[PDB]
Design a protein around this ligand. Structure first.
Ligand SMILES: Cc1cc(C)n(O)c(=S)c1
Ligand SMILES: [Zn+2]
Length: 257
C-alpha cells in the first residue's frame, strides 16, 4: 500500500490512484510574483471558539487530531468560500531535516512542516458526501518554521509518545486549535486536491502567508513517531510530504497586496 518510501512513495501513487496525474492536484509551488491580488476576496472568518476535539490518532501516514463535527461548532467561512465549512480534523506534514517538510512551497522555498486544518462544506451533509464534490472541502494550510516554540502546540507534542506507532489512538479532548494560528490571516487560494491518496479533487486551498514558529525540540518530537505498527521494525515517521505538482490551468489568488 501507498506510503512515502522508495517503492510506494509519491511517484508510485498514480498506479492505484490515477487522479494523481489529474488537472487540479496539490500541493503546488506558490509563485508570489505571479499570484494576483484579488480585491473581491473577503477576509477569512475562522470561528473556533466552540471546537470540540475528541481524539488523536497515528494512522501510519501522519497523526490526525479529530473533532466532533456533528454540529456547527468550529467553522471556516468567508475568504474565497461560499457557505460554511465545518472542521473535522487537523494533521501535519514534516521533514527529516528543518530544510524540508512542507507540501506547498513559496518561491520554491520549503518550510520545516505544514499544518492542514480540514473542513467540509455543510451543504453536503457529511464529509463522505463532501469529498464527492469539487467544492466539498476547504483546507487551511499553515507553514511551520523552526525558531521559538509555539506554546499552543505543546499539548500535541506531549501526547505523541502515547501514539508512537500505526493504529494507536489517545483521548484528546479540550484542545483549542486557535493556539496554532499565526497573527495574520492573509492568504493565497487556489483549487486543488487532498495531498494524500485518494488524492480527490475537492479542495479549496487557503494557504496562510505568515508561518508559525515552532521549536527545534517540538519538531524533533514529531520525528520520533513511527510509520510502522507496534512490534514491527522501526521506520521513523519523517518526510511524509508530497512534492509540488504541475499548476496546469490554474491561477493562485492573493488576499493581500
Ligand atoms: C482530508 C485529508 C486527509 C489527509 C490525510 N490529508 O493529507 C489531507 S491534505 C486532507
Ligand atoms: Zn494534508
Amino acid at each position: 500500500h501507498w506510503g512515502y518510501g522508495k517503492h510506494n512513495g509519491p511517484e508510485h501513487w498514480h498506479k492505484d490512484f490515477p487522479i494523481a496525474k489529474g488537472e487540479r492536484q496539490s500541493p503546488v509551488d506558490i509563485d508570489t510574483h505571479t499570484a494576483k491580488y484579488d480585491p473581491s476576496l473577503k477576509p477569512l472568518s475562522v470561528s473556533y471558539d466552540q471546537a470540540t476535539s475528541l481524539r488523536i490518532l497515528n494512522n501510519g501516514h501522519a497523526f490526525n487530531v479529530e473533532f466532533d463535527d456533528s454540529q456547527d461548532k468550529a467553522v471556516l467561512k468567508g475568504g474565497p468560500l461560499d457557505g460554511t465549512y465545518r472542521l473535522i480534523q487537523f494533521h501535519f506534514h514534516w521533514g527529516s531535516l528543518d530544510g524540508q517538510g512542507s507540501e506547498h512551497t513559496v518561491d520554491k522555498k520549503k518550510y520545516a512542516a505544514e499544518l492542514h486544518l480540514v473542513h467540509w462544506n455543510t451543504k453536503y451533509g457529511d464529509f463522505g458526501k463532501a469529498v464527492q464534490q469539487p467544492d466539498g472541502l476547504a483546507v487551511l494550510g499553515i507553514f511551520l518554521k523552526v525558531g521559538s516554540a509555539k506554546p499552543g502546540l505543546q499539548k500535541v507534542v506531549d501526547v505523541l509518545d502515547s501514539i508512537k506507532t500505526k493504529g494507536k489512538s489517545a483521548d484528546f479532548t479540550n484542545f483549542d486549535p486557535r493556539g496554532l494560528l499565526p497573527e495574520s490571516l492573509d492568504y493565497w487560494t487556489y483549487p486543488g486536491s487532498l495531498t494524500t491518496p485518494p488524492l480527490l479533487e475537492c479542495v479549496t486551498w487557503i494557504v496562510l502567508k505568515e508561518p508559525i514558529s515552532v521549536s527545534s525540540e517540538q519538531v524533533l518530537k514529531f520525528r520520533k513517531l513511527n510509520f510502522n505498527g507496534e512490534g514491527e521494525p522501526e521506520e521513523l515517521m519523517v518526510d511524509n510530504w508530497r512534492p509540488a505538482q504541475p499548476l496546469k490551468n490554474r491561477q493562485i489568488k492573493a488576499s493581500f497586496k
